[PDB]
Amino acid sequence: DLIFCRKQAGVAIGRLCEKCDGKCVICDSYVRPCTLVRICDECNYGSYQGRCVICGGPGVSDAYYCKECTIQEKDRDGCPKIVNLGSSK
Amino acid sequence: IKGGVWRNTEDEILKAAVMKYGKNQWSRIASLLHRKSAKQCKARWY
Amino acid sequence: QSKYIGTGHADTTKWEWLVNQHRDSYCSYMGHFDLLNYFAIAENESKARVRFNLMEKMLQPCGPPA
Amino acid sequence: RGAEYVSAREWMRICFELLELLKAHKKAIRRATVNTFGYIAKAIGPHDVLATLLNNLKVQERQNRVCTTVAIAIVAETCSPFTVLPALMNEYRVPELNVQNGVLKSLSFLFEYIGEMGKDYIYAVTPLLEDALMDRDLVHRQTASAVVQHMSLGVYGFGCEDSLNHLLNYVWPNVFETSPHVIQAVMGALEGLRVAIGPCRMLQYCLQGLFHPARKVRDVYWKIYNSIYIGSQDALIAHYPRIYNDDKNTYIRYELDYIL
Amino acid sequence: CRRIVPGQFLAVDPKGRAVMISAIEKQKLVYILNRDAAARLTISSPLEAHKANTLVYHVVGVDVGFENPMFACLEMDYEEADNDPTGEAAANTQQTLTFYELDLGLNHVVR
Amino acid sequence: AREFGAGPLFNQILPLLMSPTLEDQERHLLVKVIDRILYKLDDLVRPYVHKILVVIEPLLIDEDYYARVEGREIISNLAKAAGLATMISTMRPDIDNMDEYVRNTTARAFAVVASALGIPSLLPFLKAVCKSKKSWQARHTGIKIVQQIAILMGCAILPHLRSLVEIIEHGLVDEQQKVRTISALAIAALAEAATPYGIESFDSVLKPLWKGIRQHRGKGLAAFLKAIGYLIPLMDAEYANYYTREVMLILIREFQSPDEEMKKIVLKVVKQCCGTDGVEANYIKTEILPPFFKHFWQHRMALDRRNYRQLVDTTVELANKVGAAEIISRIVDDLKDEAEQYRKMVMETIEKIMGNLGAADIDHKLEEQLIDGILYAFQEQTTEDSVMLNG
Amino acid sequence: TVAELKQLVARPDVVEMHDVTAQDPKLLVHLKATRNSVPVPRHWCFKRKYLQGKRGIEKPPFELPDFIKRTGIQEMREQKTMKSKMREKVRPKMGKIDIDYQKLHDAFFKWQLTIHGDLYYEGKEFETRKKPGDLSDELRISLGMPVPPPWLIAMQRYGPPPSYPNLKIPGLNSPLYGDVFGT
Amino acid sequence: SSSESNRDRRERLRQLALPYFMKNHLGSYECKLCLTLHNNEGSYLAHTQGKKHQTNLARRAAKEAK
RNA sequence: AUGAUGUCAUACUUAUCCUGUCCCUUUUUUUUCC
Ligand SMILES: [Zn+2]
Ligand SMILES: [Zn+2]
Ligand SMILES: [Zn+2]
Ligand SMILES: [Zn+2]
């Protein structure tokens, strides 16, 4: 019902809302923000400008990856903007 | 909300509790069980 | 996983697994300047002709399937 | 910020009041709560407050216990855990099981927050993980495995791999099960162990399982072997063993046998 | 060094509009370059040329002045060779030369 | 699932999900069971596909949003679950169906299935449909399908944009009206998801459109204005100089129509046309602003929702060009107006404006009227909301 | 044939019962005998789901590493009425542990398994690592011999045991230090 | 916390009424005849107070007496 | 000496949950008069 879109990673910076603000996306954790999130403008566009990567609210900050997902190199896969398995809006 | 079906665990624990405390103290026995009241424990005994 | 080449599964055959590790070895050879140069030294050719023979052996190796 | 203006007695009372704030149905409440608990942990110092954490009845599940666990972590950071560990490790002794798995979680988050500093304490935790990973009940194997994970990412590159191999022994039997949380746990485990130990040892545990007659073993060992395969696919080359060539196919890669 | 991961072969347009990066197999990516308002170089978002089961011998930039850029990709398909138990596809299979055309307006890369 | 088979289930379900007395929750739950069983059954559902969609397509048009995202999800799972030819061969007879309802919701259905199985697979079907010579209703449907594909897929339309345009272009000149209207509308949706790229793909479409801009009365006109509106940001500031300067006239003249569809369109238009970097301030300041604040700022608008928002945005952008003190200076006096929602509107407008441009431009007296306005409006609050506070 | 398949391997012992049913035995024969690789765990074909609580009910709860034992925390940790608990909140006393931060800056620095060839499986604990030639301390005490165990004097006369034929025990054919008198 | 008192009180009550029931190295209750694991001793006791647990003791009774 | 079938029951897991959210459902026989 909820899974990654995994379109090619662009240069656009990730945007998280109030709620999701502190979370590293994949590890679900708050620890050691280090690197930065990138998603395609196909996932981030228009009404998605400054949109949350998750809930669909306005982004108040930018997501940072953990060090855990860093060494395991998961941050380099397709754009980790969750799509519900209906549309994205 | 508290009401519901009686369970072998609740029923055996009711046996032991009645054995230990005695017949006239219901509030003490209802204290041990969950989702059941004193009236229900007494009427369930008798 | 599927769209990631080299993905295995329970039904994976010998032939496919070994031809995989072959092709990956060859991409490593194309990759590392030195080890390539070692190959050029040992069997005398150009760096070029080496890489060329490898690129010929990419699809074949072990030969036909079963 | 200030924290000096108020006497310690007031503080510890604040603690014993903070303890039941963890019934909150909201996540941000618990957030601020734990971080505060760390701050006052700095204002006082570890032993008393971590003892007050270990007082916990564990009474309900999540919703929460494990928040107290997080407090044990952050408290172990705020002043050196280099002090705190023996108390905890002793408190695994207690026969009550849910708090045993509790302190296992405490180790997990603990290494997650400490990172590099685990280059020492690995040894201390190693035999206890042995006791925990050896299974009383599944949650032991699971949580302990998570500990092995975060430890395994944290210690990377510092030369402690040996004991991590030893622990990998006891990790290895747990590979088989259908329980989602323990199987995904074990997956994270063996991934961290992949990066820490290096692929060669992993693959040396994953070879024979690939072609085994049964379907189960192949399903799993191929899942593992894929996890090992995607990352570090570049470094695997050396470790594929020698496999003899059959009739129609040449399975020997002779390039590696060119000798000057 | 990977099989499918780019960085292996590298080409760029004479006008420097778009640089094309490529692996040995399956992945050929393009970054478009334009100087900023200050004439300082800014890089675009990537694109995807992906073509399944295709070996890339070499990639060379192509000259088209102020046009939709072209790229010369040497390719070969082994999918003919894997499904041919006889071994005929080992021979009788010629490496395909393909020119990809980047298109700025449509902002994708079409064969 | 695998045991009972899809036949008995749907036979015993579809009546319930069809029930006239159905709840909200009960509906949603039956939707859940349909999903969960359709994660398993794959080849089995082929006979029931239409028999499903007939109940499900009403989920796509609904007041509830979550109902809509659910519906799109389960039709995605159904189409991908079944085969392409299953879907196609299934859903043809609903194209010419007398009722337009089924035609519409069916169009959104094709949108969903096309998101599932991709545009190029389904193209020849469409491209065959829009050229159907039987009757117009079909072509109307297929064009609507082009649109709903534009909305759903959105940014991802990009590769096949050319072929899509090449399909739709033949309807702009058709003798029937609807087909023309909905056509140009679909161009609009395209370009809006086409945000700037692929301008030349729309190329051959233009010259008729501009011509039509002259001769049209009524809704179709406004529709063209919608299309052209979303187009202009995609043109070159030189060609779009001329073309824009032509659009401005009609844009002016058409402020006054009572049609609210009209006012929406021409509004967003004014945003895009006059928010163009290649437009001169003074020309807007003279020609536009006085009629703009005259007709557009009224208590018909603000009570509505979409008109409220869009109005906010357009005004914000006009501020972004002509500057701050103008707009604010004209709308300050309305902070003291009776109604709330209106005060809320000008209040959030001032908020965004002073957010972007900065307060430095503001003079003294107008600043007195500012602070007094903001206190006064803040002193009467019928509801609790952030707009006044953040403001 | 499972018979002749055993002639094609350097260590045919690796071939087992279900091995002959493998989809590719002609390889797995060559893998399973690979130099340093380790065997698959044995808990499958046992339907018991990898464990039971038979031997696991006699285990100790836990025992600390000696480095943590010398510290002294063990005695500090060890009860309370409810009103004393609400008194413990109103009264409260501080510093019950009162640890020495020097000591816990000392132990883990100043003071402070298995190789790769092993892997754990379900029931295995002690046995492999009491064998012919290897006994426990106390039973030495009952035996009462000062530092062969004396019935390996009779393993001279009557012969090497049928049960453990590979046997060597000290002084006879096995040419011994501490406890372990045979291997 | 009130919940904590119940756990304590329902262990002691199942200790009074209690030779087979025990507690493993973890905290769970177990019947050493039947090899069953019980979430709460009272819940476990009921299984311990059941007619199946009864039988398997008699069967092991006979099985030893032979 | 733990197989299968049962809507008995209790523990337990996931820093999952509990506040986010309304924005393109606007669908009709073209039809706003110096
Ligand atoms: Zn995407
Ligand atoms: Zn969010
Ligand atoms: Zn992460
Ligand atoms: Zn029993």
Curated annotation (Swiss-Prot), chain A:
- Residue numbers carrying Phosphoserine: S88
Task: Answer whether the UniProt record assigns the keyword Metal-binding to this protein.
Answer: yes
Q: What is the effect of changing Y30C?
A: No apparent effect on cell growth, localization of SF3B1 protein or formation of nuclear speckles
| UniProt subcellular location | Nucleus; Nucleus speckle
Question: Where does the protein principally reside?
Answer: nucleus
The terms describing its cellular component in GO are: nuclear matrix; nuclear speck; nucleoplasm; nucleus; precatalytic spliceosome; spliceosomal complex; U12-type spliceosomal complex; U2 snRNP
- A GO molecular function for this record? DNA binding
Residue ranges for the region (Interaction with SF3B1 and SF3B3) are 29-45
> What does the UniProt keyword field contain?
Acetylation, Activator, DNA-binding, Metal-binding, mRNA processing, mRNA splicing, Nucleus, Phosphoprotein, RNA-binding, Spliceosome, Transcription, Transcription regulation, Zinc
Pinpoint the site Interaction with SF3B3: V11
Residue positions binding Zn(2+) 1: C5, C40, C43, C79
Where do the annotations place Zn(2+) 2 binding? C17, C20, C52, C55
State the source organism's domain of life: Eukaryota
Q: Where is this region: Interaction with SF3B3?
A: 73-76
Presence of the UniProt keyword Zinc in the record: yes
Residues engaged in binding Zn(2+) 3: C24, C27, C66, C69
Listed under GO biological process in this entry are:
mRNA splicing, via spliceosome; positive regulation of DNA-templated transcription; stem cell differentiation; U2-type prespliceosome assembly
Q: Which cysteines are joined by disulfide bonds?
A: none
Q: What does this protein do?
A: Component of the 17S U2 SnRNP complex of the spliceosome, a large ribonucleoprotein complex that removes introns from transcribed pre-mRNAs. The 17S U2 SnRNP complex (1) directly participates in early spliceosome assembly and (2) mediates recognition of the intron branch site during pre-mRNA splicing by promoting the selection of the pre-mRNA branch-site adenosine, the nucleophile for the first step of splicing.
The family assignment reads: Belongs to the PHF5 family.
Q: Protein name, please?
A: PHD finger-like domain-containing protein 5A
Highest classification ranks of the organism: Eukaryota, Metazoa, Chordata, Craniata, Vertebrata
- Residue span relative to the full protein: 7 to 95 of 110
Swiss-Prot record, chain D:
Region feature (Interaction with SF3B3 and SF3B5): 204-260
PTM text: Phosphorylated. Phosphorylation occurs concomitantly with the splicing catalytic steps. Citrullinated by PADI4.
Residues the UniProt record annotates as site (Interaction with SF3B3): E161
Q: Provide the residue intervals of the HEAT repeats.
A: 8-46, 78-116, 119-157
Q: Which organism is it from?
A: Homo sapiens (Human)
Q: Which residues of the full protein are shown?
A: 1045 to 1304 of 1304
Q: How does it assemble?
A: Component of the 17S U2 SnRNP complex, a ribonucleoprotein complex that contains small nuclear RNA (snRNA) U2 and a number of specific proteins. Part of the SF3B subcomplex of the 17S U2 SnRNP complex. SF3B associates with the splicing subcomplex SF3A and a 12S RNA unit to form the U2 small nuclear ribonucleoproteins complex (U2 snRNP). Within the SF3B complex, interacts directly (via HEAT domain) with SF3B3, SF3B5, SF3B6 and (via HEAT domain) with PHF5A. The SF3B subcomplex interacts with U2AF2. Identified in the spliceosome C complex.
What is the stated purpose of this protein?
Component of the 17S U2 SnRNP complex of the spliceosome, a large ribonucleoprotein complex that removes introns from transcribed pre-mRNAs. The 17S U2 SnRNP complex (1) directly participates in early spliceosome assembly and (2) mediates recognition of the intron branch site during pre-mRNA splicing by promoting the selection of the pre-mRNA branch-site adenosine, the nucleophile for the first step of splicing.
Protein name per its UniProtKB record: Splicing factor 3B subunit 1
Tell me which stretches of the chain form a coiled coil: none
Q: Which residues make up the annotated site Interaction with RNA?
A: Y5, L97
Protein localization: Nucleus; Nucleus speckle
Which residues lie within the region annotated Interaction with PHF5A? 112-113
Report the sequence similarity comment from the record. Answer: Belongs to the SF3B1 family.
UniProtKB/Swiss-Prot annotation, chain F:
Regarding protein family, the annotation reads: Belongs to the SF3B1 family.
Enumerate the residues marked as the site Interaction with SF3B3.
K80, C155
Chain's gene name: SF3B1
Residue positions, PTM N6-acetyllysine: K32, K40
PTM info: Phosphorylated. Phosphorylation occurs concomitantly with the splicing catalytic steps.
Entry keyword Phosphoprotein: yes
Q: What is this protein called?
A: Splicing factor 3B subunit 1
Q: What does this protein do?
A: Component of the 17S U2 SnRNP complex of the spliceosome, a large ribonucleoprotein complex that removes introns from transcribed pre-mRNAs. The 17S U2 SnRNP complex (1) directly participates in early spliceosome assembly and (2) mediates recognition of the intron branch site during pre-mRNA splicing by promoting the selection of the pre-mRNA branch-site adenosine, the nucleophile for the first step of splicing.
Q: Where in the cell is it found?
A: Nucleus; Nucleus speckle
Coarsely, its chief localization is: nucleus
Q: Could you provide one GO biological process annotation from this protein's UniProt record?
A: U2-type prespliceosome assembly
**Which residues does the annotated region (Interaction with SF3B14) include?**
7-46
> Cellular component GO terms, alphabetically?
B-WICH complex; catalytic step 2 spliceosome; nuclear speck; nucleolus; nucleoplasm; nucleus; spliceosomal complex; U11/U12 snRNP
Interaction with PHF5A: annotated segments: 25-28
Q: Where is this site: Interaction with PHF5A?
A: E70
Which domain of life does the protein's organism represent? Eukaryota
UniProt keyword Acetylation present: yes
Site Interaction with RNA: give positions. Y65
A single MF term (Gene Ontology)? mRNA binding
- Ranges: HEAT repeats: 7-46, 47-81, 82-119, 121-155, 158-196, 241-279, 321-359
> What keyword terms does UniProt attach to this protein?
Acetylation, Citrullination, Isopeptide bond, mRNA processing, mRNA splicing, Nucleus, Phosphoprotein, Repeat, RNA-binding, Spliceosome, Ubl conjugation
UniProtKB/Swiss-Prot annotation, chain G:
Phenotype upon changing F46A = Does not affect methylation by PRMT9
Modified residue Omega-N-methylarginine is at which positions? R48, R55
Result of mutating R11K? Does not affect methylation by PRMT9
Q: Tell me where on the tree of life, at the top rank, the source sits.
A: Eukaryota
Q: Cite the post-translational modification comment.
A: Methylation at Arg-48 by PRMT9 is required for the interaction with SMN1.
Annotated compartments: Nucleus; Nucleus speckle
* Cross-link entry Glycyl lysine isopeptide (Lys-Gly) (interchain with G-Cter in SUMO2), positions: K32
| Impact reported for R70K | Does not affect methylation by PRMT9
Q: Which residues carry this modification: Symmetric dimethylarginine?
A: R48
Q: Which residues cross the membrane?
A: none
Assembly and partners are described as: Component of the 17S U2 SnRNP complex, a ribonucleoprotein complex that contains small nuclear RNA (snRNA) U2 and a number of specific proteins. Part of the SF3B subcomplex of the 17S U2 SnRNP complex. SF3B associates with the splicing subcomplex SF3A and a 12S RNA unit to form the U2 small nuclear ribonucleoproteins complex (U2 snRNP). Within the SF3B complex, interacts directly with SF3B4. Found in a complex with PRMT9, SF3B2 and SF3B4. Interacts (Arg-508-methylated form) with SMN1 (via Tudor domain). Interacts with RBM7. Interacts with ERCC6. Component of the minor spliceosome.
| Protein function | Component of the 17S U2 SnRNP complex of the spliceosome, a large ribonucleoprotein complex that removes introns from transcribed pre-mRNAs. The 17S U2 SnRNP complex (1) directly participates in early spliceosome assembly and (2) mediates recognition of the intron branch site during pre-mRNA splicing by promoting the selection of the pre-mRNA branch-site adenosine, the nucleophile for the first step of splicing.
Q: Which gene encodes it?
A: SF3B2
